[PDB]
Amino acid sequence: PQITLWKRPLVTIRIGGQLKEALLNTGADDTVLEEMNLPGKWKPKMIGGIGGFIKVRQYDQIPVEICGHKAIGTVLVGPTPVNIIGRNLLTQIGCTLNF
Amino acid sequence: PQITLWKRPLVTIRIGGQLKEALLNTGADDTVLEEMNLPGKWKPKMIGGIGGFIKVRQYDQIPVEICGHKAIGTVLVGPTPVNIIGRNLLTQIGCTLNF
Amino acid sequence: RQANFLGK
């Protein structure tokens, strides 16, 4: 697909048959999802942006289906206003910026 | 050019004769640079991120060259962790996301 | 991690 930047680059992802809308975010090193219950061991982590830091839980080797593409990696869960797909998963689906 | 996301997408930009490192951020609506002076009148605005709600200075119609592609639009200046090129300037240089 | 997301 070719996604233009006139609008926020929102696409549908699927995590364990829970389907949500998330932002394709080249400005994010990590993927951060608003509250969901993921299984497995989760470790506390702090991540910052504009405004400061939020506490999130880091879940490792979590399958994420982004637009037909099978993604598997680290997913952070916390009080993020919008769901974010970061560079960790973006690189796995073969995503680039082209101009 | 084509930019992969294994590393953060930092590029050199020229703004007011000055060269800076900035990050191509498709998860940012707007372009925010770290503290600096620029030519103008400016309106104060508030914008929010993962952390919350900062105060920035808004400059309108400012020329910025990104990897030599010419843009002219809004540029906010404030307490951003890194220089960020948002979607308002990314669209002008015809930047897209592909996979 | 700095997931520099922004709206406004």
Side-chain angles (χ1 to χ4, degrees), chain A residues 13 15 18 21 31-40 42-43 54-59 75-84:
Chain A
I13 50 136
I15 297 191
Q18 212 182 153
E21 259 215 331
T31 296
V32 191
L33 307 199
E34 179 183 31
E35 250 303 294
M36 83 177 284
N37 265 60
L38 280 173
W42 67 258
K43 91 183 313 159
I54 74 178
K55 205 228 267 197
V56 305
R57 319 190 308 281
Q58 174 185 311
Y59 289 91
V75 160
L76 311 176
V77 181
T80 184
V82 189
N83 292 277
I84 301 170

Side-chain angles (χ1 to χ4, degrees), chain A residues 23 27-28 30 47-48 82, chain C residues 3-7:
Chain A
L23 196 61
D30 309 307
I47 63 181
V82 189
Chain C
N4 289 267
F5 156 84
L6 274 155

